[PDB]
Design a binder for these strands. Structure first.
Lengths: 143, 150, 129
RNA sequence: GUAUCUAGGACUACCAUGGUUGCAACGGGUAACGGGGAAUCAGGGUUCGAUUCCGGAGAGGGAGCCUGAGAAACGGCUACCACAUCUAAGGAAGGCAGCAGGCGCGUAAAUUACCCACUCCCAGCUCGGGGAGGUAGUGACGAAAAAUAACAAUACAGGACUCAUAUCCGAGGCCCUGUAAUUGGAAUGAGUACACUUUAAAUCCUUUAACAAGGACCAAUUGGAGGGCAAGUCUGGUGCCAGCAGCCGCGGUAAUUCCAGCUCCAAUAGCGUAUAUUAAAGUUGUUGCGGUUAAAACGUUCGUAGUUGAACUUGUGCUUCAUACGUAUGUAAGCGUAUUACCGGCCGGUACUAUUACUUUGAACAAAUUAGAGUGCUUAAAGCAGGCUUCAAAUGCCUGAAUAUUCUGUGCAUGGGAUAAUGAAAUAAGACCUCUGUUCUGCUUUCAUUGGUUUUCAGAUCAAGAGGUAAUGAUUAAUAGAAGCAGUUUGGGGGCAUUAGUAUUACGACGCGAGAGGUGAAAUUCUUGGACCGUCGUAAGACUAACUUAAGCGAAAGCAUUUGCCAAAGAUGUUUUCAUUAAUCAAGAACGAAAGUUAGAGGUUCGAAGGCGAUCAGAUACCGCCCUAGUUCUAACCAUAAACGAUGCCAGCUAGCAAUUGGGUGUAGCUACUUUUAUGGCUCUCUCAGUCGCUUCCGGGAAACCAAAGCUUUUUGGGCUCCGGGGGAAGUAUGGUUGCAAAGCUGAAACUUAAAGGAAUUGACGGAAGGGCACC
RNA sequence: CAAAAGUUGACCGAACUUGAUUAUUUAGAGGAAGUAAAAGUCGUAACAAGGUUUCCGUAGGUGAACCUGCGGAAGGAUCAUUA
């Protein structure tokens, strides 16, 4: 069924393989270097950005919730991202014009769950971490 | 196969097992050889000789009586036609149907089939150039083809 | 047409044993097939094979014990550099104890067991279990 | 020729027209130095490498140069361009991608420490210099080893054992395990800290006094507890709010998901999370996917590259010997145009010999790494130490720091002759050999020496004749293909001329009258009397109802009146020919319904658009009328359709029956006839190749189904192409291409989103279909 | 005989200017898409013959859906019966 299974067909497999791997979604991303070109992270694990605005993101059905996201502009690219503030209360911790760490939601891009267009997480406000602040183990550096 | 059409239909020559026989056949290899020369001089192609002689004689197979096939016999005595007979006939048909198309243009089935008849000539001729029975870079072109048949 | 003649015959054998049928007509039987088939005989996998002299290309009638689960044919004949003998036997053979992988080796068409004794690797023809 | 250390288009004159390319060149991109290597694995692979080594490269970007064995050097110079510096204003001087340090960039990375003691290098050197390197400091990238307590006993707890009693139930009580902040003395230093050891000198370790244990002390975590996923249907607060949730989902007042508490679980000196990668992922498929319907056959074929490719061609054996158990023969030696021939005593050379791909065995494979040998680095990561008679006396005895593979492939050398190709020579200047001293090329010994002449030798090759030698050079014809064909024969195959039939429409004549078309009912529209209709003819254009199919042909689109011609295709048949020609295919091409388009003819019919009557909120529609482009034909486009049998093509094989198309073998079958025949058609019988059906699989599948969608393996099967790898965006954007244009091809992504599709099942529901049942 | 500043002709040629070219980035009136849509406005298009079977190619017209015309297919509502 198909494959050139002859003794000296040897080039043809490689050629055809590259024609088939053209369609391979992970290899498209790798070869075409889409991370650096289109994705707001330049394949860079974290990005520090500046907080523009706090957004009251209305959830997709069957869930009626106001799910509290934050608009962030990365220092390297000026690119606008909406990132979610995970773990409790948290917009109260964000404060407009603070320096915030933008991390992703572990989803190979793709918008969260029932949360429209929020491909990203927040892990830190003012270099402390959100996480520490909720538990109360740490207290916010002044300004 | 049937490369021109989908047609699976094979009908081919069942050759009698006995490689030396027939025993009843009074006639020498010289006798059959002589008739092959005479009929070939009359302008009979080796196919036409091979069928006519079987019925008229008994020549069961030309190969069996005299060790050499018709074409080989003709060649040794120098009766061999410049282009092997199978090409001659294909080339005759291609010229004939091309002449038909000049007369009756817009036969869409005929032109399509015109390509098939040239296509087979080129391929079959390609083999003979390998045998060197055709001088290397011998080419089928239509201009010359018309003359060739006649 | 029939680029590898080998596989066409050995498929016929599989299909035949799938009925349970003790006989098969094989077409158009090669030297490689004759050597494949003699290799079968030694381990008792098939009963007697007989090659009829048509002045055409040789047909074979196979007599089958039915000891054979399945017989497969390798094309392309992948170059075995002696230590891929171990890899190829593991993959397609049901057991390490039994089942012969069949090669075209320098000294003949031989099983991998025989090939190991002679220390002559090869190109792979086949698998019989 | 010049240059140079050197070959060399490195450079230059002259002179040729070459060199590279679908085996992807040239160009563009690359978080692209390369390799040794690393990561992750069942293997196979995939990914990584900027960095601890090796080689090369560069030193802001570039160029030029001196010295010197060596630098086109930058911690040399000279220049420019860009940067930076000082200045008494004339000028001059510089390269942290060296070590620290600072700034900036960023997700992201340390001390303005000490030393040549170790390691070693350079120098004129025993000695100096050394941010080469070592040393400390910083360092949860990462790896490696675990301090943080333990036992009786007391307080009650469990489980055996006993006394019991034997649902119940109490008393004695044990190796224990514990829930207790009850007790009691013990243990051992992590830490601390003399001292010693370390060290160049300090540091920490390895040592060890003095010190340190009732945790509240020597005082552990980070996520989770609805499910995935391990553990609360807990308690307060909140109540689809806050917020939670990688996903599905939770939260609308028993919240087992929230926020806490409490209880607990899972992994604890680590764990969470992000990003990249790999496993899973069979979701990339070489190994090893899918394509009827799930995402998938290009409309179809020709067809070149590519790719693939049938059978036949040193080989079987016989005998005996040795050697495992009368055997067996596998091993050894014999015998039949490549194991023939010497020399030296079967051995070992020499003379030797089809090309390859492959494969075999060798060398040649950098260390680290990787695997791992030897070995108690006190464990261990691993270090490469060290162990021994012996802590005696003592260099005494000593093993060491292997072996493999990754450094692939390749190349070298060697063996095999299977597989797949190639090879003479059938237009025989064919292969040997041998005879012409025939031919041509061609010579150092010895004729004392040295030179000239010519013989032998023909030193040693070649080429040309003639003869003898030869199995003397032509393999089958794949239930492969090509081709012709005795021919038989098929078909709505194609083109052209032609022919018939009625109708639809229109017209006239005739003829009789006030209605007619049309529908759900109607009205428009047709008629003022002669529509509409009848009858008769004729004009125009179109088209072949029924017959006509599970029926044919054609490569496919498509092809249904008659007849003629021209050529084609296919099945059958062929003891014809050819003798692997072939199979399938990027590219490229041929044909390619309809609409749409260019120009005519043609326009009857139907009839997009328009305008009309009803219907209907709307009708713009279905419906009714008029009808345009269009249908048709011709010369051109277009290249697309459910171009569908949603199913690539070629080959073999795997199941019964009856149809069905065609040919053939037998018809002592019926009928047609000549005195009966001979002939023909059909059945009957038999068989191929065609298209399918039925019912079963005797396999596949998720099923519906499928005799192919089977043989698709147990991660495999003949050969070959094309296409899919979540759903949408999107067949769109963009560019290129083709097109007159309409369009068509090639064909993304951003971003969006947890489903999406197919199946069958049962319900519900129908202005889908059939039965019943009741004076709601 | 050595020999400085200067200097002749050559070859390398940084650098600069201007045309051409390529890769890569990014402003933009406005136009024209898609998406999130999640309380809306207008229709019922398809899903049962969706009350006009569905659906394809292609053109035009309708507010839109869509309708219509021409040729199709069945993924139909005919796997059919019907001398």
């Amino acid at each position: 069924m198909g494959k050139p299974r002859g003794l000296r067909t040897a080039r043809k497999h490689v050629n055809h393989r590259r024609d088939q791997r053209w369609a391979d979604k992970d290899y498209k991303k790798a070869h075409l270097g889409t991370r650096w070109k289109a994705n707001p992270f330049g394949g860079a694990s974290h990005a520090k950005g500046i907080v523009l605005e706090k957004v009251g993101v209305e959830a997709k059905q069957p869930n009626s919730a106001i799910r509290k996201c934050v608009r962030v502009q990365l220092i390297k690219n000026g690119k606008k991202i909406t990132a979610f503030v995970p773990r409790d209360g948290s917009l109260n911790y964000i404060e407009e014009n603070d320096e915030v760490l933008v991390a992703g939601f572990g989803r190979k891009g793709h918008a969260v769950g029932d949360i429209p267009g929020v491909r990203f997480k927040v892990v830190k406000v003012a270099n402390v971490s959100l996480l520490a602040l909720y538990k109360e183990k740490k207290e916010r550096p002044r300004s | 196969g049937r490369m021109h059409a989908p047609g699976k239909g094979i009908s081919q020559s069942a050759l009698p097992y006995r490689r030396t026989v027939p025993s009843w056949l009074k006639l020498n290899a010289d006798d059959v050889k002589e008739q092959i020369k005479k009929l070939g001089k009359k302008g009979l192609t080796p196919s036409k000789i091979g069928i006519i002689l079987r019925d008229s004689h008994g020549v069961a197979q030309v190969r069996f009586v005299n060790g050499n096939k018709i074409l080989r016999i003709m060649k040794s005595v120098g009766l061999k036609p410049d282009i092997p007979e199978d090409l001659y006939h294909m080339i005759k048909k291609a010229v004939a149907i091309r002449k038909h198309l000049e007369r009756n243009r817009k036969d869409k089935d005929g032109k399509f089939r015109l390509i098939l008849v040239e296509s087979r000539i080129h391929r079959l001729a390609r083999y003979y150039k390998t045998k060197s029975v055709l001088p290397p870079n011998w080419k089928y072109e239509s201009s010359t083809a018309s003359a060739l048949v006649a | 047409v029939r680029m590898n003649v080998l596989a066409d015959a050995l498929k016929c054998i599989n299909n035949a044993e799938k009925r349970g049928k003790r006989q098969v007509l094989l077409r158009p039987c090669s030297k490689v097939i004759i050597k494949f088939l003699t290799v079968m005989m030694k381990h008792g996998y098939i009963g007697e094979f007989e090659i009829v002299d048509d002045h055409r290309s040789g047909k074979i009638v196979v007599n089958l014990t039915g000891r054979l689960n399945k017989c497969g044919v390798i094309s392309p004949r992948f170059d075995v550099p002696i230590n891929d003998i171990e890899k190829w036997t593991n993959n397609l053979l049901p057991s390490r104890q039994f089942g012969y992988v069949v090669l075209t080796t320098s000294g003949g068409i031989m099983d991998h067991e025989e090939a190991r004794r002679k220390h002559l690797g090869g190109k792979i023809l086949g698998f019989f279990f």
